Amino acid sequence: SRKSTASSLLLRQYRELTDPKKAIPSFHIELEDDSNIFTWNIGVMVLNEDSIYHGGFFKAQMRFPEDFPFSPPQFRFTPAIYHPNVYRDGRLCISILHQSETWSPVQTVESVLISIVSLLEDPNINSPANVDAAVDYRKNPEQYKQRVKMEVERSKQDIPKGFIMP
Ligand SMILES: [Zn+2]
Ligand SMILES: [Zn+2]
Ligand SMILES: [Zn+2]
Ligand SMILES: [Zn+2]
């Protein structure tokens, strides 16, 4: 009921983010089991040539509550990546997904995803989920860069067969 309303709202956004003319090339969107509208498997791409993340295909899972959009989704990198705002188990800590800028019911999946790729490139080192990565980011940029490069290379193993990287 609230679940029914949430599922219709999520389907509308899913269709926008997967319709050939509305899709955003940075984000490859699928549903869990090709049918669960409340759990999306997302491939995050960093199209900015400047980024140490460029060329990766970072798999993640976005889980939506049954009262969406009145509560935020959760977002987990699968596998975890080395980033100041990513917990060791892959959970992303980002202000737009905190209740109650924090989450609001006018936020969309598109706005969250945009915020996430922005945070990849510009981490919040003042509120770090991974203090090791936060320290490396500012004090050991070459160490940080080499760790991210390794993870970029690892991530290419998750590019689905047939998928055409943007
Ligand atoms: Zn796909
Ligand atoms: Zn390129
Ligand atoms: Zn948090
Ligand atoms: Zn270190």
Numbering used by the authors: 3 to 102, 113 to 178
Question: What does the report in the manuscript say about this coordinate set?
Answer:
As an E2, Cdc34 is the central player in a cascade of enzymes that includes an E1 ubiquitin activating enzyme, Uba1, and a large family of Skp-Cullin-F-box (SCF) E3 ubiquitin ligases that function in tandem to assemble Lys48-linked Ub chains on proteins to target them for proteasomal degradation. Uba1 is a multidomain enzyme that serves as the gatekeeper of the Ub conjugation cascade by activating Ub in a two-step process involving adenylation and thioester bond formation followed by transfer of Ub to E2s in a process termed E1-E2 thioester transfer or transthiolation. Additionally, Cdc34 contains unique structural features that are crucial for efficient polyUb chain extension through poorly understood mechanisms, including an acidic loop insertion proximal to the active site and a long C-terminal extension. To better understand the molecular bases of Cdc34 activities, we here determine crystal structures of Cdc34 alone and in complex with Uba1, as well as a Cdc34~Ub mimetic that represents the product of E1-E2 thioester transfer.
To investigate potential Cdc34 conformational changes that accompany Uba1 binding, a 1.7 Å structure of ScCdc34Δdist alone, Cdc34apo, was determined. Comparison of Cdc34apo and Cdc34E1-bound reveals two conformational changes that accompany Uba1 binding, both within E1-interacting regions. When bound to Uba1, this extended region of hA melts but remains ordered and projects away from the helix. The second conformational change occurs on the opposite side of the E2, where hC of Cdc34apo (hCapo) is extended N-terminally by one residue and sits at a different angle compared to hCE1-bound. Modeling Cdc34apo onto the Uba1–Cdc34 complex reveals a mechanistic role for Cdc34 conformational changes that accompany Uba1 binding (middle). Second, the extension and altered angle of hCapo positions Val143 such that it clashes with the SCCH, whereas Cdc34E1-bound Val143 is shifted away from the SCCH and makes productive contacts with Uba1 Asn694 and Phe695 (and 5b, right). Our Cdc34apo and Uba1-Cdc34 structures reveal combinatorial Uba1 recognition of Cdc34 involving a distinct Cdc34/UFD interface and conformational changes in Cdc34 that accompany Uba1 binding.
